[PDB]
């Protein structure tokens, strides 16, 4: 018998300085904020792991 | 009064498995062997040095 206060959900930011809510939506729509030209990897283990 | 034996100048390798002598022209025409995509760097100094 008491009212429960509701607080609006905050928001996050994405590329081009624009706002959204879900990180997945921003990734599938605008991608990341900063860009790296690429990544060079390196693996350890068994050859089955390699394949 | 003695013989002067001569030995020819050897060669080096470049991109696409060719050969040449001068590294400058070989780089300017065919390029390196392994590719790098980014030279993300950092410097230290004063305002004049950065400018």
Task: Explain what the structure shows.
It is classed as dna binding protein/dna/rna. The entry lists the keywords sparta, Ago, Tir, DNA binding protein/DNA/RNA, DNA BINDING PROTEIN-DNA-RNA complex. The entry is titled "CrtSPARTA Octamer bound with guide-target". The structure is cut from a larger assembly and holds two copies of chain A (51 residues). A two-stranded antiparallel ribbon of chain A has the order 1-2. The first copy, chain A, contains two helices and two strands; from the N terminus they run ββαα. The first copy, chain A, has 51 residues and is an alpha+beta fold. Helix content of chain A is 22%, strand content 12%. In chain A, a hairpin with a 3-residue loop joins β1 (12-14) and β2. The termini of chain A are far apart. Chain A binds chain B through residues 36-38, and chain B through 37-38, 40.
Brief descriptors of the model:
51 residues, two-stranded antiparallel sheet, part of a larger assembly, 2 helices, alpha+beta, Piwi domain-containing protein (chains A, B), 2 chains
What are the SSEs and their pairings?
The structure is cut from a larger assembly and holds two copies of chain A (51 residues).
Chain A (H helix, E strand, L loop, with lengths): L11 E3 L3 E3 L2 H7 L17 H4 L1
- Sheet with most strands: strand arrangement of chain A: 1-2
Alpha-carbon distance between the two ends of chain A: 62 Å
**Rg of chain A, alpha carbons:** 20 Å
Q: What is the number of strand segments of chain A?
A: 2
Protein chain pair with the most extensive contact, residues per chain: A-B, 3 and 3 residues
Strand content of chain A: 5-15%
Structural class of chain A: alpha+beta
Describe the main β-sheet of chain A briefly: 2 strands, antiparallel
Helix content of chain A: 10-25%
Q: Outline of chain A, from the CA principal axes?
A: elongated
What is the H/E string of chain A?
Answer: EEHH
Number of helices of chain A: 2
Indicate the multimeric state.
part of a larger assembly
Organism (chains A, B): Thermoflavifilum thermophilum
Protein name (chains A, B): Piwi domain-containing protein
PDB class: dna binding protein/dna/rna
Keywords: sparta, Ago, Tir, DNA binding protein/DNA/RNA, DNA BINDING PROTEIN-DNA-RNA complex
